[PDB]
Amino acid sequence: ERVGEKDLRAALEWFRSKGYLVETNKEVNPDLEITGLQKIFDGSLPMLFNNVKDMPHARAITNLFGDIRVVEELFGWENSLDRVKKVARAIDHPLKPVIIGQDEAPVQEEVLTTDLDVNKWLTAIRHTPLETEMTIGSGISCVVGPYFDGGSHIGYNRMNFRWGNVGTFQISPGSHMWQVMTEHYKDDEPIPLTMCFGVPPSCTYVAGAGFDYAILPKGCDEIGIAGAIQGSPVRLVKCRTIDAYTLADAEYVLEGYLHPRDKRYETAESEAADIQGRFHFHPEWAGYMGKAYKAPTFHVTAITMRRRESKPIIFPLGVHTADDANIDTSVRESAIFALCERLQPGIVQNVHIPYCMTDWGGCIIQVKKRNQIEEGWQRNFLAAILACSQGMRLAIAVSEDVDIYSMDDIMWCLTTRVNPQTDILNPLPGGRGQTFMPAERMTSGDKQWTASNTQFEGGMGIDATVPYGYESDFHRPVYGVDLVKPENFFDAKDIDKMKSRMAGWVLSLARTGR
Amino acid sequence: ERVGEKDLRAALEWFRSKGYLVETNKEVNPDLEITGLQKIFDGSLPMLFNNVKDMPHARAITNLFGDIRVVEELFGWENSLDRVKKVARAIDHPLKPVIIGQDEAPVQEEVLTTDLDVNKWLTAIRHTPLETEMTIGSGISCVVGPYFDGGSHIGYNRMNFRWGNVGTFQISPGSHMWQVMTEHYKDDEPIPLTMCFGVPPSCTYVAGAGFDYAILPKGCDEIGIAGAIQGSPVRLVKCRTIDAYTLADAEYVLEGYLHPRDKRYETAESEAADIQGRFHFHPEWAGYMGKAYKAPTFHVTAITMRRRESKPIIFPLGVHTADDANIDTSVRESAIFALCERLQPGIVQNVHIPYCMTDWGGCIIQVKKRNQIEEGWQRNFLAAILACSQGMRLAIAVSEDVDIYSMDDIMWCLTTRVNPQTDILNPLPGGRGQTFMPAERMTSGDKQWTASNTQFEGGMGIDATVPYGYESDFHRPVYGVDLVKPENFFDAKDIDKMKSRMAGWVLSLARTGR
Ligand SMILES: CC(C)(COP(=O)(O)OP(=O)(O)OC[C@H]1O[C@@H](n2cnc3c(N)ncnc32)[C@H](O)[C@H]1OP(=O)(O)O)[C@@H](O)C(=O)NCCC(=O)NCCSC(=O)c1ccccc1C#N
Ligand SMILES: CC(C)(COP(=O)(O)OP(=O)(O)OC[C@H]1O[C@@H](n2cnc3c(N)ncnc32)[C@H](O)[C@H]1OP(=O)(O)O)[C@@H](O)C(=O)NCCC(=O)NCCSC(=O)c1ccccc1C#N
Ligand SMILES: [Ca+2]
Ligand SMILES: [Ca+2]
Ligand SMILES: [Fe+3]
Ligand SMILES: [Fe+3]
Ligand SMILES: [Fe+3]
Ligand SMILES: [Fe+3]
Ligand SMILES: [K+]
Ligand SMILES: [K+]
Fold this sequence. Notes:
The structure is cut from a larger assembly and holds two copies of chain A.
Chain A lengths: L7 H11 L3 E3 L9 H7 L6 E3 L9 E4 L5 H8 L4 H13 L5 E3 L9 E3 L5 H4 L18 E6 L5 E6 L2 E2 L5 E4 L6 H8 L7 E7 L3 H7 L14 H9 L4 E4 L6 E3 L4 E14 L2 H6 L20 E12 L7 E2 L7 H22 L4 E5 L9 E6 L9 H12 L5 E5 L8 H10 L7 E2 L12 H4 L18 E5 L27 H9 L4 H8 L2
Parallel strand pairs in A: 1-2, 3-15, 4-11, 17-18, 18-20
Antiparallel strand pairs in A: 2-3, 5-14, 6-7, 6-10, 8-9, 9-14, 10-13, 11-12, 13-14, 16-17, 19-20
Helix pairs in contact in A: 4-8, 4-10, 7-8, 7-10
One fe (iii) ion (FE) binds next to strand 7 of chain A.
């Protein structure tokens, strides 16, 4: 029982074969060093640390999804558009997970039912020097079967184990875990779930999804979507101490129960002062320094893992990195594309959630109007995206003559193609927002800065598309960059010099001559 | 091959057994008499006309879905809420249709491949004296297989056969047929489809659906939904002259090809004057007198039907009737409920599209806020409903202490629970609307009054819910109608007199004592 099928170790072997893996044997400190090195090389190749300070049994990998190109190469996609379309198709066609025996699951080689000190086995890290606690943010929640209406859910939840085998469990209001906890908020028994660490890359990719429940509602099969993404079923295994299932090919597994009504503070400082929304926790998805809140507790009852001599791998990652941004926004883009295609097929050409747009904060859709009867569909798309993606603050629609991956080109569209009196939608003022946005959280006023007091401003949908029938007046003409060859005029040396001095919007403008 | 399984004849037998069927042998005139009698008994029991003027082979039934109570009894539902929930569940769990042999399909007992005069076999009717043409509005389009991405579509399309075997084909912009025609607008071959008449009641129920493509996108299985609604698979049969499938248990079937680029006028008058949007056609779904437009043509190549001595039944119905309203708004309500449940489960308690709200015009959702973190979800629901239901003009959200079926109670909520400065949403001004709404169609100005020139005003979402935490101040208290018994004070005669003098909002207020 020591082989993961399409597991993280196979991905590491593939990275090493492609030359995309950077290893080191120097001992890395989980306190400020892993996240520091990840931010120094933000959006770069994966880094594998063989020696982690005070964790002789663990290896740490980071920047696994830092470069979207290497991720697309790992999953067999040509480019971002191909990835979006293939992931939408996978969302509509899940692969049912397969259950294997308890004696052939690689993640159950070692089963610790006592001596449950999570912080001794799972690597907790500190992101910034301003933090006080070391937290665990590498595990994905896994709920399979009756508690998810016969489907399966996988997603990240940050945990702070400050009571040995009991830690806080951060749940986004409105998410799948929030819906499960709300349905069972007044039950007598706790919710049995497991946290998986070092899972297969497809499971991480699908766990990044969130707040796309018009496409991935409660009862869907997220593990099935991961299996369809990886081209084969994901293996499940029955837990040892609870009635649930786990990812058999993970590296660590925490079995336990979620107590919805047993809420405790995430940090000792906030627990002392007894207020939420202040007292920094660590950097969050909106790009701001974090805050600490009360949260339900996760009561661990068993710690399963691979053979400790094999040094099971854990994937710790800073929040404000290209890694986390890719992990969330990839399936977010695919789900937004699927929704727009459901509403009216053939109009949306591409969807992109750039790193700068705060994974749950905004998105960009590219629409192509084929005739006069399709004019106005971009506004329906913007309103539907803002309403079906809770707390999304800025959705932008652009035409097909726009480079959706260049923020400079988007800014140009905003400057030249937006009528400020009619092209700025504010669909749902007073709806549900995201508490982690400081602009929204500051609307609490003098109340507790939690989700119970914030007041959403309604989002912002910007229609920066060209009106149909005015494509000649809004034409970005072309420069003759294909009609002349620089080799006829200069030598290779000068051409390389001039090319090396180029960066930014000019790279996009020179490719298209636009 | 002469038995429909759960067909229209079985429904007629059930109605007769329950005493819900009203028969007559007097010859009814399809010109102004069928629709006149249907409007005289709007929302009443089904009427079966055994003798139709100039149609010795046809029987006509009307008001089949006129009373929602008899429909719910036919399909085995307790009430409207049970119907909505069961139909949502059926939408999420379709039954795959079964294919039967060409020699056991009841609808293929007689196959006319020549002498194709549709108006001689299919009963065309005139709705109002202001019309000039007699049109066919009893058949549902049926597209199965490759042209619907492996799914199945059923829906109504009004046809005017003024060229013998070639008639106009009215397609709503944005609908499933519109999406199919747009995908194949420039193909060389025409689109093979069939029009079914006198279909099973579940197929009519599902064909009533429209503009709910976040729940029923292109590629879904609408015939599967009908089968799940009726509790058994719907039978299909291979066509005779085209490569397609039809409802085997129908009464008539028109096989042919849809020519998207071969557009002709629906009436001779509009064809002469050569303008669209004027020159009345017949009453439409918005409750206004109709207009005539250009439309693609349906080229019939075969007319299959049951044995002409059995007098196959046809279901002609006026547009502005409780029948049509039920037929559309039932699955509309179920799909809106499904969408609201996908966005955030447990908040929406009931969805109702009243007759007065112009099937595609508006809806009412009833929300119950369980805690402070759910305040504001009604606005997300309203925005999502307005954006994902093309051209919807008025969505209203009310609290759980409201009778969703009483328009007086909704008006009371509008009067007392709407802040005009913050509770009226206008989410998507300039989006896609419905051309058949005169308020929208008048925005064309001096252009052609078609879908290419209308300018949607953005819809209207009214949040008439009670803010969370103010349920004591917005409490409709109760009167003690359960604490006193009228028999102790008056005799049965006076009680019946007083009860007979009551009607309207007082019936709802007296049941709840509110
Ligand atoms: C809002 C909340 C939780 C509430 O807590 P509070 O505002 O303090 O109010 P409350 O809970 O004490 O009272 C409440 C009363 O409503 C009843 N009630 C309460 N809940 C339920 C329920 N589920 N079902 C049924 N009834 C319920 C109770 O009946 C009663 O509570 P009880 O009396 O029973 O105790 C509040 O604490 C709170 O954490 N905000 C912030 C939470 C939040 O945005 N995370 C987002 C996580 S994204 C994230 O990281 C991330 C994502 C991507 C990338 C990087 C990162 C990072 N890096
Ligand atoms: C808007 C339309 C159709 C357009 O027609 P027009 O405005 O006149 O413009 P157009 O078609 O001539 O030109 C167009 C140009 O865009 C290109 N193009 C056009 N279409 C396509 C396409 N599908 N795919 C790709 N390209 C396309 C062509 O390339 C070029 O056309 P071409 O040059 O090729 O000919 C226009 O006629 C029209 O009927 N409005 C009204 C239609 C409408 O609301 N029904 C709603 C039916 S609910 C109903 O009853 C009902 C429902 C429930 C209950 C009761 C009732 C009743 N009782
Ligand atoms: Ca992205
Ligand atoms: Ca209705
Ligand atoms: Fe989930
Ligand atoms: Fe614009
Ligand atoms: Fe359809
Ligand atoms: Fe209100
Ligand atoms: K997820
Ligand atoms: K339909």
